[PDB]
Coordinates of C-alpha atoms in Angstrom, one line a residue:
Chain A
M1 CA 132.1 69.4 30.6
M2 CA 128.9 71.4 30.0
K3 CA 127.1 68.3 28.7
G4 CA 127.7 66.6 32.0
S5 CA 125.5 69.3 33.5
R6 CA 123.0 69.3 30.7
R7 CA 122.2 65.7 31.3
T8 CA 121.5 66.6 34.9
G9 CA 118.8 68.9 33.4
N10 CA 118.0 66.5 30.6
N11 CA 117.2 63.8 33.2
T12 CA 115.7 66.1 35.8
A13 CA 114.1 63.3 37.7
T14 CA 114.2 64.1 41.4
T15 CA 112.0 62.6 44.1
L16 CA 109.7 65.6 43.7
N17 CA 109.2 65.1 40.0
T18 CA 108.9 61.3 39.9
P19 CA 107.4 58.6 42.1
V20 CA 109.8 56.3 43.9
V21 CA 108.3 53.0 42.9
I22 CA 105.5 52.1 40.5
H23 CA 103.8 48.7 40.7
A24 CA 100.8 47.4 38.9
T25 CA 98.5 45.9 41.5
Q26 CA 96.3 43.8 39.2
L27 CA 96.3 42.7 35.6
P28 CA 95.6 45.1 32.8
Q29 CA 91.9 44.7 31.9
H30 CA 91.0 46.0 28.5
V31 CA 88.3 48.6 27.8
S32 CA 85.9 49.5 25.1
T33 CA 85.7 52.5 22.8
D34 CA 82.5 53.5 24.7
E35 CA 84.6 53.5 27.9
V36 CA 87.6 55.4 26.4
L37 CA 85.4 58.1 25.0
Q38 CA 83.5 58.3 28.3
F39 CA 86.8 58.7 30.1
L40 CA 88.4 61.3 27.9
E41 CA 85.2 63.4 28.0
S42 CA 85.7 63.4 31.8
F43 CA 89.5 63.7 32.1
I44 CA 89.7 66.7 29.8
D45 CA 86.7 68.3 31.6
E46 CA 88.4 67.9 34.9
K47 CA 91.6 69.7 34.0
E48 CA 89.8 72.6 32.3
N49 CA 87.4 73.9 34.9
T50 CA 100.6 75.7 33.6
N51 CA 101.8 72.3 32.6
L52 CA 99.5 69.6 31.1
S53 CA 98.3 71.9 28.2
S54 CA 100.8 70.3 25.8
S55 CA 99.5 66.9 26.9
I56 CA 95.7 67.6 26.7
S57 CA 96.3 69.0 23.2
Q58 CA 97.4 65.5 22.3
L59 CA 94.4 64.0 23.9
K60 CA 91.9 66.1 22.0
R61 CA 93.3 64.6 18.8
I62 CA 92.5 61.2 20.2
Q63 CA 89.1 62.4 21.3
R64 CA 88.6 63.6 17.8
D65 CA 89.9 60.2 16.6
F66 CA 87.5 57.8 18.4
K67 CA 84.4 59.5 17.2
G68 CA 85.0 62.2 14.6
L69 CA 86.8 62.5 11.3
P70 CA 89.6 64.9 10.0
Chain B
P1 CA 101.4 41.7 39.5
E2 CA 100.0 39.0 41.8
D3 CA 103.3 38.9 43.7
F4 CA 102.9 42.6 44.6
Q5 CA 99.2 42.4 45.4
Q6 CA 99.9 39.5 47.8
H7 CA 102.8 41.6 49.1
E8 CA 101.0 44.9 49.8
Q9 CA 98.2 42.9 51.4
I10 CA 100.7 41.4 53.9
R11 CA 102.2 44.8 54.7
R12 CA 98.9 46.5 55.4
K13 CA 97.9 43.5 57.5
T14 CA 101.1 43.6 59.5
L15 CA 100.7 47.3 60.2
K16 CA 97.1 46.7 61.2
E17 CA 98.1 44.2 63.8
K18 CA 100.6 46.6 65.3
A19 CA 98.2 49.6 65.6
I20 CA 97.1 49.8 69.2
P21 CA 93.6 51.3 69.2
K22 CA 92.9 54.5 71.0
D23 CA 91.2 52.9 74.0
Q24 CA 93.9 50.3 74.6
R25 CA 96.8 52.8 74.7
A26 CA 98.5 52.9 78.0
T27 CA 101.5 55.2 77.7
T28 CA 102.0 58.6 79.3
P29 CA 99.5 61.4 78.6
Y30 CA 102.3 64.1 78.8
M31 CA 104.5 65.3 76.0
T32 CA 107.9 63.8 76.8
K33 CA 110.4 66.7 76.2
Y34 CA 111.7 64.9 73.1
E35 CA 108.4 64.9 71.4
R36 CA 108.3 68.6 72.2
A37 CA 111.7 69.2 70.8
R38 CA 110.9 67.4 67.5
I39 CA 107.3 68.7 67.0
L40 CA 108.7 72.2 67.2
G41 CA 111.6 71.1 64.9
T42 CA 109.4 69.5 62.3
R43 CA 106.7 72.2 62.3
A44 CA 109.2 75.0 62.0
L45 CA 110.8 73.0 59.2
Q46 CA 107.5 72.8 57.3
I47 CA 106.6 76.5 57.8
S48 CA 109.9 77.5 56.1
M49 CA 108.8 75.5 53.1
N50 CA 105.6 77.6 52.7
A51 CA 103.2 75.4 54.5
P52 CA 99.9 77.0 55.6
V53 CA 100.2 78.6 59.0
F54 CA 97.3 78.6 61.5
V55 CA 98.3 81.5 63.7
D56 CA 98.5 85.3 63.4
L57 CA 102.2 85.6 63.2
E58 CA 103.0 89.2 64.3
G59 CA 106.1 90.0 62.3
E60 CA 108.0 86.9 63.6
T61 CA 110.8 85.9 61.2
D62 CA 112.2 82.9 63.2
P63 CA 110.3 79.8 62.0
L64 CA 110.9 78.2 65.4
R65 CA 109.2 81.0 67.3
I66 CA 106.2 80.7 65.1
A67 CA 105.9 77.0 65.8
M68 CA 106.2 77.7 69.6
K69 CA 103.2 80.0 69.1
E70 CA 101.2 77.2 67.5
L71 CA 102.1 74.7 70.2
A72 CA 100.7 77.2 72.8
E73 CA 97.4 77.4 70.9
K74 CA 97.2 73.6 70.1
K75 CA 97.1 74.3 66.3
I76 CA 99.9 72.0 65.2
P77 CA 98.5 69.3 62.8
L78 CA 101.0 66.6 63.7
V79 CA 100.7 63.1 65.2
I80 CA 103.2 61.4 67.4
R81 CA 103.6 57.7 66.7
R82 CA 105.0 56.3 70.0
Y83 CA 106.8 53.0 69.2
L84 CA 106.8 50.2 71.6
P85 CA 109.8 47.9 71.3
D86 CA 108.1 45.0 69.5
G87 CA 107.3 47.4 66.6
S88 CA 103.7 48.1 67.7
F89 CA 102.7 51.7 68.2
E90 CA 100.3 54.2 69.5
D91 CA 99.1 57.4 67.7
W92 CA 98.9 60.5 69.8
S93 CA 97.7 63.8 68.3
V94 CA 99.5 66.9 69.6
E95 CA 96.2 68.4 70.6
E96 CA 95.5 65.8 73.3
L97 CA 98.9 65.5 74.9
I98 CA 99.9 67.7 77.9
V99 CA 102.7 70.2 77.7
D100 CA 104.9 70.5 80.7
Chain C
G1 CA 121.7 51.9 73.1
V2 CA 120.1 51.4 76.5
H3 CA 117.2 53.7 76.9
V4 CA 113.9 54.2 78.7
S5 CA 111.0 52.6 76.7
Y6 CA 107.5 53.9 76.7
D7 CA 106.3 51.2 79.1
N8 CA 109.0 52.5 81.5
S9 CA 111.2 49.4 81.1
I10 CA 114.9 49.9 80.5
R11 CA 115.7 48.1 77.3
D12 CA 118.6 47.7 75.0
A13 CA 118.6 48.7 71.3
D14 CA 117.5 45.3 70.0
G15 CA 114.7 45.1 72.5
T16 CA 116.3 42.9 75.1
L17 CA 115.1 43.9 78.5
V18 CA 117.6 45.1 81.2
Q19 CA 115.4 46.5 83.9
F20 CA 111.7 46.8 84.5
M21 CA 111.8 50.4 85.9
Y22 CA 114.7 52.8 86.1
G23 CA 116.0 52.1 89.5
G24 CA 112.8 50.6 90.8
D25 CA 111.0 54.0 91.0
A26 CA 111.3 55.5 87.4
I27 CA 112.4 58.8 88.9
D28 CA 114.8 61.1 87.0
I29 CA 117.9 62.0 89.1
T30 CA 117.8 65.6 88.0
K31 CA 114.2 65.9 89.4
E32 CA 114.3 64.1 92.7
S33 CA 116.2 66.8 94.7
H34 CA 113.4 68.4 96.7
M35 CA 111.2 65.3 96.3
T36 CA 112.0 64.2 99.9
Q37 CA 112.4 67.8 101.2
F38 CA 108.9 67.9 102.8
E39 CA 109.5 70.9 105.0
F40 CA 110.5 72.9 102.0
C41 CA 107.5 71.8 100.0
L42 CA 105.2 72.8 102.8
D43 CA 106.6 76.2 103.4
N44 CA 106.2 77.0 99.7
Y45 CA 102.9 75.2 99.2
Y46 CA 101.0 77.8 97.3
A47 CA 104.0 78.8 95.1
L48 CA 104.6 75.1 94.3
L49 CA 100.9 74.5 93.6
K50 CA 100.6 76.6 90.5
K51 CA 103.7 74.9 89.1
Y52 CA 102.5 71.3 89.6
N53 CA 99.1 72.7 88.6
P54 CA 96.4 70.0 89.3
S55 CA 93.3 71.9 88.2
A56 CA 93.9 71.5 84.4
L57 CA 95.0 67.9 84.9
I58 CA 92.4 65.8 86.7
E59 CA 90.6 64.8 83.5
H60 CA 93.5 63.2 81.7
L61 CA 94.5 60.7 84.3
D62 CA 92.9 58.2 86.7
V63 CA 93.1 59.2 90.3
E64 CA 91.5 56.8 92.7
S65 CA 92.6 53.4 91.3
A66 CA 96.2 53.5 92.5
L67 CA 95.4 55.3 95.8
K68 CA 93.0 52.4 96.6
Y69 CA 95.6 49.7 95.8
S70 CA 98.3 51.5 97.7
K71 CA 96.5 51.5 101.0
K72 CA 96.0 47.7 100.7
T73 CA 99.7 47.3 100.1
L74 CA 100.5 49.7 103.0
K75 CA 98.2 48.1 105.5
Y76 CA 99.2 44.6 104.6
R77 CA 102.9 45.4 104.7
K78 CA 102.9 46.8 108.3
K79 CA 101.2 43.6 109.5
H80 CA 104.3 41.8 108.2
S81 CA 107.3 43.8 109.1
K82 CA 108.8 41.7 112.0
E83 CA 109.2 38.7 109.6
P84 CA 112.4 38.2 107.7
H85 CA 112.5 38.7 104.0
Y86 CA 112.2 35.0 103.0
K87 CA 109.0 34.7 105.1
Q88 CA 107.4 37.7 103.4
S89 CA 104.1 36.8 101.8
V90 CA 103.7 37.8 98.2
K91 CA 100.0 38.7 97.9
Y92 CA 100.5 42.3 97.2
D93 CA 103.2 43.1 94.6
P94 CA 104.2 46.8 94.7
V95 CA 102.0 49.4 93.1
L96 CA 104.5 50.4 90.5
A97 CA 104.4 46.9 89.1
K98 CA 100.6 47.2 88.7
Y99 CA 100.0 50.8 87.5
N100 CA 101.9 53.2 85.2
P101 CA 103.4 56.0 87.3
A102 CA 102.7 58.6 84.6
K103 CA 99.1 57.4 84.0
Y104 CA 97.8 56.8 87.6
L105 CA 98.0 59.3 90.4
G106 CA 99.2 57.8 93.6
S107 CA 101.3 54.9 92.1
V108 CA 104.5 55.6 94.1
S109 CA 107.7 53.8 95.1
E110 CA 107.2 52.3 98.5
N111 CA 110.2 54.1 100.0
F112 CA 108.7 57.5 99.1
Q113 CA 105.4 56.4 100.6
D114 CA 107.1 55.5 103.9
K115 CA 108.9 58.8 104.1
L116 CA 105.7 60.7 103.3
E117 CA 103.7 59.0 105.9
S118 CA 106.4 59.4 108.5
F119 CA 106.4 63.1 107.8
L120 CA 102.6 63.5 108.1
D121 CA 102.4 61.6 111.3
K122 CA 105.1 63.5 113.2
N123 CA 104.3 67.0 112.0
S124 CA 100.9 68.7 112.7
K125 CA 100.9 72.1 111.1
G126 CA 95.7 76.8 105.8
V127 CA 97.0 73.6 104.4
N128 CA 95.5 70.2 105.3
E129 CA 97.3 66.8 105.2
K130 CA 94.9 65.6 102.5
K131 CA 95.9 68.3 100.0
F132 CA 99.5 67.9 100.8
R133 CA 99.4 64.3 99.9
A134 CA 97.8 65.4 96.6
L135 CA 100.7 67.8 95.9
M136 CA 103.5 65.4 96.7
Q137 CA 102.0 62.6 94.7
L138 CA 101.6 64.8 91.7
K139 CA 105.2 65.9 92.2
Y140 CA 106.2 62.2 92.1
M141 CA 104.3 62.0 88.8
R142 CA 106.0 65.0 87.3
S143 CA 109.5 63.9 88.3
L144 CA 109.5 60.7 86.4
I145 CA 112.0 59.6 83.8
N146 CA 111.0 60.4 80.3
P147 CA 110.7 57.7 77.7
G148 CA 113.6 57.8 75.2
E149 CA 116.0 59.0 77.8
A150 CA 119.5 57.6 77.2
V151 CA 120.0 56.1 80.7
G152 CA 122.9 54.0 79.4
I153 CA 125.2 56.8 78.4
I154 CA 124.3 58.7 81.6
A155 CA 125.0 55.7 83.8
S156 CA 128.4 55.2 82.1
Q157 CA 129.2 58.9 82.3
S158 CA 128.3 59.0 85.9
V159 CA 131.0 56.4 86.7
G160 CA 133.8 57.1 84.3
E161 CA 133.8 60.8 85.0
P162 CA 134.2 60.8 88.8
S163 CA 136.8 58.1 88.3
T164 CA 139.2 60.8 86.9
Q165 CA 139.4 61.9 90.5
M166 CA 140.7 58.9 92.5
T167 CA 144.0 58.0 90.8
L168 CA 145.9 58.4 94.1
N169 CA 148.1 56.0 96.0
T170 CA 147.9 54.3 99.4
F171 CA 146.2 56.7 101.9
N172 CA 144.5 46.2 102.9
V173 CA 141.9 46.0 100.1
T174 CA 142.5 47.1 96.5
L175 CA 141.6 50.8 96.3
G176 CA 140.1 53.1 93.7
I177 CA 140.6 52.6 90.0
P178 CA 142.3 49.2 89.9
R179 CA 139.5 47.8 92.0
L180 CA 137.1 49.5 89.6
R181 CA 139.0 47.9 86.7
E182 CA 138.4 44.4 88.1
Chain D
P1 CA 123.8 73.5 63.4
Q2 CA 122.4 73.9 59.9
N3 CA 118.7 73.0 60.0
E4 CA 115.6 73.6 62.2
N5 CA 115.5 70.1 63.7
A6 CA 118.8 70.7 65.3
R7 CA 118.0 74.2 66.4
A8 CA 115.0 72.8 68.2
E9 CA 117.4 70.6 70.2
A10 CA 120.1 73.0 71.1
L11 CA 117.3 75.2 72.6
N12 CA 115.3 72.5 74.4
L13 CA 117.4 69.5 75.1
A14 CA 121.0 70.6 75.3
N15 CA 120.7 74.2 76.4
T16 CA 122.4 75.3 79.5
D17 CA 119.2 76.1 81.4
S18 CA 118.2 72.4 81.5
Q19 CA 121.7 71.4 82.5
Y20 CA 121.5 72.9 86.0
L21 CA 121.8 69.6 87.8
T22 CA 124.2 66.9 86.8
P23 CA 122.8 63.4 86.6
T24 CA 125.7 61.8 88.5
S25 CA 124.2 62.5 91.9
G26 CA 121.7 65.3 91.3
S27 CA 124.0 68.1 92.5
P28 CA 124.0 71.5 90.8
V29 CA 127.0 72.4 88.7
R30 CA 126.1 76.0 87.7
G31 CA 126.8 79.0 89.9
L32 CA 129.0 82.0 90.5
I33 CA 132.6 81.0 91.1
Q34 CA 135.3 83.2 92.8
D35 CA 134.7 86.9 93.3
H36 CA 131.0 87.0 93.1
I37 CA 131.2 84.7 96.1
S38 CA 133.5 87.0 98.0
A39 CA 131.3 90.0 97.2
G40 CA 128.2 88.5 98.6
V41 CA 129.8 88.2 102.0
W42 CA 130.3 92.0 101.9
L43 CA 127.1 93.0 100.2
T44 CA 124.8 90.8 102.4
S45 CA 126.9 91.7 105.5
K46 CA 125.4 93.6 108.4
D47 CA 127.7 96.5 107.9
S48 CA 126.3 97.3 104.5
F49 CA 124.2 100.4 104.4
Chain E
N1 CA 119.3 23.2 36.3
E2 CA 118.2 25.5 33.5
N3 CA 114.5 24.7 33.4
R4 CA 113.9 26.7 36.6
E5 CA 116.9 29.1 36.0
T6 CA 115.7 31.1 33.0
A7 CA 112.1 31.1 34.2
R8 CA 113.0 34.0 36.5
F9 CA 114.3 35.8 33.3
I10 CA 111.8 34.8 30.6
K11 CA 108.8 35.6 32.7
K12 CA 110.5 38.9 33.5
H13 CA 110.2 39.8 29.8
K14 CA 106.9 38.2 28.9
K15 CA 104.1 40.8 28.9
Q16 CA 101.0 39.9 30.8
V17 CA 97.8 40.6 28.9
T18 CA 97.9 40.1 25.1
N19 CA 95.9 42.4 22.8
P20 CA 92.9 40.7 21.2
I21 CA 91.5 41.4 17.7
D22 CA 87.9 42.4 18.3
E23 CA 84.5 43.3 16.9
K24 CA 85.2 41.3 13.7
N25 CA 87.2 44.4 12.5
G26 CA 90.6 42.7 12.6
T27 CA 92.1 45.6 14.6
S28 CA 93.5 45.0 18.0
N29 CA 92.7 47.0 21.2
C30 CA 95.7 48.6 22.7
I31 CA 94.1 51.0 25.2
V32 CA 93.9 49.2 28.6
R33 CA 93.2 50.2 32.2
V34 CA 95.6 49.1 34.8
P35 CA 95.4 49.8 38.6
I36 CA 98.8 50.7 40.0
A37 CA 100.4 51.8 43.2
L38 CA 102.9 54.7 43.7
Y39 CA 105.2 56.0 46.5
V40 CA 105.1 59.7 46.1
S41 CA 106.4 62.7 48.0
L42 CA 103.8 65.2 49.2
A43 CA 105.3 68.6 49.8
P44 CA 104.4 71.0 52.6
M45 CA 102.8 73.6 50.4
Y46 CA 100.2 71.0 49.5
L47 CA 99.8 69.9 53.1
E48 CA 96.3 71.4 53.2
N49 CA 95.4 70.1 49.7
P50 CA 97.0 66.7 49.4
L51 CA 95.2 65.5 46.3
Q52 CA 96.1 68.5 44.2
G53 CA 99.7 68.0 45.2
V54 CA 100.0 64.3 44.2
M55 CA 98.4 65.1 40.8
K56 CA 100.5 68.2 40.1
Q57 CA 103.8 66.8 41.1
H58 CA 103.8 63.1 40.2
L59 CA 100.7 62.3 38.0
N60 CA 100.6 65.3 35.6
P61 CA 104.3 64.8 34.4
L62 CA 103.4 61.2 33.7
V63 CA 100.7 61.6 31.0
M64 CA 101.4 61.1 27.3
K65 CA 104.9 59.7 28.0
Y66 CA 106.2 56.1 27.9
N67 CA 106.3 54.5 31.3
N68 CA 108.4 51.4 31.6
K69 CA 106.4 49.8 34.4
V70 CA 103.0 49.8 32.8
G71 CA 104.7 49.3 29.4
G72 CA 102.9 51.9 27.3
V73 CA 102.0 55.5 26.8
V74 CA 100.0 56.8 29.9
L75 CA 96.9 58.6 28.7
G76 CA 95.3 59.8 31.9
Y77 CA 94.4 58.8 35.4
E78 CA 91.3 58.1 37.4
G79 CA 90.5 57.5 41.0
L80 CA 93.5 58.8 42.9
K81 CA 93.3 57.6 46.5
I82 CA 95.8 58.2 49.3
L83 CA 96.4 55.3 51.6
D84 CA 96.2 56.4 55.2
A85 CA 99.1 55.6 57.5
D86 CA 96.6 55.1 60.3
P87 CA 94.9 51.7 60.0
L88 CA 91.6 52.6 61.6
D89 CA 86.5 56.1 54.4
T90 CA 87.3 59.5 56.0
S91 CA 88.8 62.9 55.1
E92 CA 91.4 63.4 57.8
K93 CA 94.1 61.0 56.6
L94 CA 97.7 61.3 57.6
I95 CA 101.1 60.7 56.0
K96 CA 104.5 60.1 57.4
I97 CA 107.0 63.0 57.5
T98 CA 110.7 62.1 56.9
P99 CA 113.0 63.0 59.8
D100 CA 115.6 65.1 57.9
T101 CA 113.3 66.9 55.5
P102 CA 109.8 68.4 56.0
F103 CA 108.3 66.4 53.1
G104 CA 106.0 63.4 53.5
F105 CA 106.0 60.2 51.6
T106 CA 102.9 58.1 51.1
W107 CA 101.3 55.3 49.1
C108 CA 98.5 56.0 46.5
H109 CA 96.3 53.9 44.3
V110 CA 95.3 55.2 40.9
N111 CA 93.9 53.7 37.6
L112 CA 96.0 54.5 34.6
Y113 CA 94.6 54.2 31.0
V114 CA 97.6 53.3 29.0
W115 CA 98.1 52.6 25.3
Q116 CA 99.8 49.2 24.9
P117 CA 100.9 48.3 21.4
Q118 CA 102.5 44.8 21.0
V119 CA 103.9 42.7 18.2
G120 CA 101.5 40.8 15.9
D121 CA 98.8 43.4 16.4
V122 CA 96.8 45.5 14.0
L123 CA 96.9 49.3 14.0
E124 CA 95.1 51.5 11.5
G125 CA 96.3 55.1 11.1
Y126 CA 96.5 57.9 8.6
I127 CA 99.4 58.1 6.1
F128 CA 100.9 61.6 6.5
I129 CA 103.9 61.2 4.1
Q130 CA 105.1 58.5 1.8
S131 CA 108.4 58.6 0.1
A132 CA 110.8 56.5 -2.0
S133 CA 112.0 54.7 1.1
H134 CA 109.1 54.2 3.6
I135 CA 105.4 54.9 4.4
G136 CA 105.1 57.2 7.3
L137 CA 102.0 57.2 9.5
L138 CA 100.2 58.5 12.6
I139 CA 98.2 56.3 14.9
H140 CA 95.1 57.7 16.6
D141 CA 96.2 61.2 15.4
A142 CA 98.9 61.2 18.1
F143 CA 101.4 58.2 17.8
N144 CA 104.0 58.2 15.1
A145 CA 104.4 55.1 13.0
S146 CA 106.4 54.1 9.9
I147 CA 106.5 51.2 7.4
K148 CA 109.9 50.9 5.7
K149 CA 110.7 49.5 2.3
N150 CA 111.8 46.0 3.2
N151 CA 108.3 45.4 4.7
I152 CA 106.5 46.9 1.8
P153 CA 105.0 44.2 -0.5
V154 CA 106.8 43.5 -3.7
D155 CA 103.5 43.8 -5.7
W156 CA 103.3 47.4 -4.6
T157 CA 105.4 50.0 -6.5
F158 CA 106.1 53.6 -5.5
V159 CA 104.9 55.8 -8.4
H160 CA 106.8 59.1 -8.5
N161 CA 105.4 62.6 -9.0
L162 CA 106.8 63.6 -2.8
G163 CA 104.9 60.8 -4.6
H164 CA 101.7 58.7 -4.7
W165 CA 101.5 55.0 -4.3
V166 CA 100.5 52.0 -6.4
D167 CA 99.1 48.8 -4.9
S168 CA 98.9 45.4 -6.5
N169 CA 95.9 46.6 -8.5
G170 CA 97.0 50.0 -9.6
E171 CA 95.3 52.2 -7.0
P172 CA 96.5 55.0 -4.8
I173 CA 96.2 54.1 -1.2
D174 CA 94.4 56.5 1.1
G175 CA 95.6 57.8 4.5
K176 CA 93.8 55.1 6.5
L177 CA 96.0 52.0 6.2
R178 CA 95.9 48.6 8.0
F179 CA 99.3 47.1 9.0
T180 CA 100.8 44.6 11.3
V181 CA 103.1 45.7 14.2
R182 CA 106.9 45.1 14.2
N183 CA 109.2 46.2 17.0
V184 CA 107.9 49.1 19.0
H185 CA 110.7 51.5 19.6
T186 CA 111.0 53.4 22.8
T187 CA 114.5 54.8 23.4
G188 CA 113.7 58.4 22.5
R189 CA 111.3 60.7 24.2
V190 CA 109.1 59.9 21.2
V191 CA 107.3 56.5 21.0
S192 CA 107.8 54.9 17.6
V193 CA 105.9 52.0 16.2
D194 CA 107.7 50.3 13.4
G195 CA 105.4 48.1 11.4
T196 CA 105.1 45.7 8.5
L197 CA 102.7 45.2 5.6
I198 CA 103.5 41.6 4.8
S199 CA 101.7 38.8 6.5

């Protein structure tokens, strides 16, 4: 039925949207709050010189989280 | 994680041993009529998906006649990888080959 | 799956080798028609010169390395011609087994070289003999088989197709298709 | 054929212009057949003015 | 028999690097940097700008969403680098076009900062609601959490007005609450951290 076509749109994962394989190449090495806050200051600055605005809006809450206070 | 790092490292080493360097390559310096029929095929197939075109197309609507105009001006940014039958290969840019 | 490789050897699909050149000379059949028509290639020298255009071509290929080795194998082979084939000395293997025919000018099947020197020594005719060698050796270089050519399908289509033409009866030895089927 | 890779091979590899000589012996297979033959014996004759 | 049979199953499910409690705060550290590799499809409109194409097609739809391979919420990326198909660094790299289609597939390395919550860890977030069945929370102002009734301590009572809270000493608890991590739920398009308050 129609829901058999909506889950083609609910998945919507082609080989243009998604990578084919993802493999971690080393072990996950932890970071510090001084390195997270240094990264988010640079990642948000890079994208703000579309999509992604709904995501960055969730990162600015975390940038407000590691240093500031609601 | 270690089993992939030691797996990519094999693959980029195997493909390094099979790359013939540009001074050791000893195949024909001409474009061998199948390379020509596939460069023009692949370049015309990229142009129709809105790739940037490096020629003043004068109202030409056929994508294949556009790519035949770029091959005449040596503006095609492709590379032929000529396989030798062990798996080793030679890279030949389209700019340096000779068109019959 | 038998095709011309890029080192001009005829190989199967898994890489097993069948021949070392296509017929011993690596010449395409659909190109070698006027290759031994030397009287035609001399009467049309200038019109055939800007087809096999050498001026834009003498910087992508070595020229004198194969011409030097050919005259050694030509001079040494006429000194040993009265000998039978089993007393032939094997100092000088042919120039196609030493140099790539599409890479080196002058590397040429030894039967084409004999026909070309027999033409130039029995015919004294604005065209030299030196520049006519240079045309007919570039023409050998542009009439070669291309790598990737399906010479296995072609060789099978060049036998099965004219065999639809000889089904007839007696006109001592087995004749025609039943001989070909043995 | 339905893409540009195959149109580049019906124009450059399998077109009729490259199929002038057959690979069986190197003989041509393309030419005028019956009445264009019998018209060139009258056109190129010496009576034609 | 079975000693080296389930090892190819148990170690499939054991996560690699455990979160430590740090800085004598008691709270764990769940943001981690992992270098990964991808196999992505560069498209011909980005054939002149390849790095903008890999970011806009494959990397930008990957942020703030749970990825199964890194096992967490991907925050952002750093240091995208396309592997050249020519083992000669340089600008003029080259990728391999598929025969049927005009696209090109290639390998890339990138560093992902992911948020990695695990069991037995400590997460402190604001309380945004609390009701007569649960304590609902955020984590880092972005990540939804909840503490249900059967993991609320018995010495704590839910005073009713929406309603405030009573601890074991008769105090309203603030937004910032320390709790210990139960099963992290994934199956939605929302990442949920169920938690406990008991030790």
